[PDB]
Subunit: 370 residues, 2 copies
Amino acid sequence: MTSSADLTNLKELLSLYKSLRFSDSVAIEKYNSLVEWGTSTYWKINSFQIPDEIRSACNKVLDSDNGIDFLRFVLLNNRWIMEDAISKYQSPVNIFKLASEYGLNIPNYLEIEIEEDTLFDDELYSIMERSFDDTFPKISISYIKLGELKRQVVDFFKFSFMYIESIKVDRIGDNIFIPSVITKSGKKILVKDVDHLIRSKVREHTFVKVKKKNTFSILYDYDGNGTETRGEVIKRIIDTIGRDYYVNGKYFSKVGIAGLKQLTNKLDINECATVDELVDEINKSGTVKRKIKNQSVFDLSRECLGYPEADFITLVNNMRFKIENCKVVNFNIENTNCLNNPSIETIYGNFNQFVSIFNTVTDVKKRLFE
Amino acid sequence: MTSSADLTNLKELLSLYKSLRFSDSVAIEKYNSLVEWGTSTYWKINSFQIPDEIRSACNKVLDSDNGIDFLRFVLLNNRWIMEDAISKYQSPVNIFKLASEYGLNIPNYLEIEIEEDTLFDDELYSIMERSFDDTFPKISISYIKLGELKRQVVDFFKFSFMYIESIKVDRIGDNIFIPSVITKSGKKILVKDVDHLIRSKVREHTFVKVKKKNTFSILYDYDGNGTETRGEVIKRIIDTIGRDYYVNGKYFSKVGIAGLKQLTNKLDINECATVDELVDEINKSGTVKRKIKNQSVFDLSRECLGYPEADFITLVNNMRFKIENCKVVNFNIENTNCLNNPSIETIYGNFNQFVSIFNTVTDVKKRLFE
């Protein structure tokens, strides 16, 4: 009832099971048939970097069914609100509960049992809309029918032209802000990130397409006559936001102790909340002092920010400056073409942080070999 | 006067000279200094596939000075008209003469000796414009100052709105055509390739931007409100050109014996100008007959055209057909979304050739095992 034949079949399963990733075709078809046979005899056979707070719970709930290949999160308001995962056999009904058990933000799952496949209308979405209470701006009303791995998607909306007057920031978390487009008619409009704002060509004192929906209203993508190149937009908005914010990831952040933070990082020392604490920690560290001594404020304050080696220079050589006491007080870029390079604008938006850490390292280097 | 030291220096030059491609930095700086020393002691230390007619002469004239890293050709009217090459020390004055000696099309080099760097005006370009006699549509008036590796570029022009009425082909070579936009005012307008035409939202019976210049007038790129997706354009133009042309490279070509040509290619046989010659050559070839027998007209007439394996199917499954005697007489695609894929439109434009070779292989397979 157990022979050598089954042994041979399972041996081939053994050998090619973890060569399945890139096997040859006959192996994959044989495996489809041998998972078949063994199951009745042997019973076993555009998103970006999500930091770890979510990846831990992801690693747990992916153990709930090995058909799960990814998890689908909506990033909103600096929150990862899962809605489902790409599973092959497990209906997400356990999955959102699990993700709730593992610290993943889930929505208010108010799913009307649908018998006949239908698309929702005025009430059919409105009433669920009240019942949802989405402090998160999620506008896709989708219903999962259990028995499938897809969904029914309903959403209705208008669009018009709104007259912007100015652009703002709005704190949403720790030191983090978003743009709230302010209109000549006293209304605020939302966007997703900084790059949504950029892509829009958003400026002041004109009309633009906006998609108006009842619970939320979102600044509509762009469709018009674009002659205003990207760099001009980047420069304009970087000035408009103010000189106190740099751009971290999808968001802003004020310049502050994070400079001392990164710097203490780069020199293998303890956290120093103030500057004299820093100079002390350096001074007692003969190696850190002696490895500052050989360097320049410029090379060091750019190595503490990881700009690659060179294109930094194509930037630097494109602006004029204002210095006293060997210390930057002002600066301004005058040729805007370089910003049209991708690797360039990531450095440009991230500049005021570099200026500040530069002044700081200047000061410590002055007072240390003082 | 020759010692062991020089031996050591040249040995390092020897070792790292052809590691220079990806050496480490000290090696490259040492090499900069040792090319220096040895030269006084040892005296030695968006273009696409250009077919070989030009690459042979390229390989010769790149031997004229090893500072030459590429050659810059302007492709025009199915001709590779060189204008210079990226040389580091050799002024192109010998290079265009060389390229003339090796069968490379050169322009009419009428260069006014400039003393003071200046930009040309009405006469200053016009007179040279007559003297040039460019049966090729090259509009860049650039002057090389000898003593540099750059140029002075002058060109002035207007633009307006022209009312197209229809679109045409125009034979330029062997079996090759171009589009000549025909306007409601009886004028013809030029373009570079098919893709210029595509990325031009070109249709019938409306106004579009055109850049008007004295000797040539060129259909201006697009800048307007684009809501008409790419696939719709592809379909429209493929129909407009006619059912007798497929798209080879940047150009068109009539369907014809090239089918028999490619087919004879794929089956390792002699050229057969007519179909019965073909059936004979197959019939006497027992191996070729016997390797047709196992196949299907479809798989074979798609292998003779190299469509990869699969997306062909996403195409095929998107159109309706018209067959008699197991032989396609008509077809028409009804879902246009797939054309927005790049690998898809290259197959779509190249279709009528496939239809024709399909009918042919059907016929030979019928008459052979007849």
